[PDB]
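request received
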Amino acid sequence: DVSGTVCLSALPPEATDTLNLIASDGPFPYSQDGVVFQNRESVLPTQSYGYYHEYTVITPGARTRGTRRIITGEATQEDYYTGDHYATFSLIDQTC
Amino acid sequence: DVSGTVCLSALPPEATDTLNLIASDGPFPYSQDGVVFQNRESVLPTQSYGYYHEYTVITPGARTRGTRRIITGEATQEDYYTGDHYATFSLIDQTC
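response:
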């Protein structure tokens, strides 16, 4: 399940950067950006394969990709944030 | 024959999710949710066609709809669990 909705303004500023890159279709900093998210554990709503894609939200100072991501769904405004490597998700509200 | 009664708290958590959806009549995750269960091998009591319906119990980690299902009958609380693709069934006790 999804934890609830969070305003974009209440998430780390790097989440705003990632959403801006998704709207322009890149370029993305990481090679993994844009790959399909399988939702193997069924935390998000069940959908067809390819419905979900994953993008990095940079963690300042990290050497690796870290634990923060945005998962897009195919529906309008359907974007989920995770700050714990896919354990929990919140829907992002871009209007606040 | 129904193989016994099982407490709802003993089943995987997704069985509770499915029973909640059945109570609200969905919307369901799969298009096959809510089809008639034919009871072809007569494991459950014999009834007219249409008496039983089947619903998916999601299995996290599976690549398919998996083997877990809830079958409803028309009587109150008549809900059966199968974890083995219709081989065996237990009546669910929602009070424990």
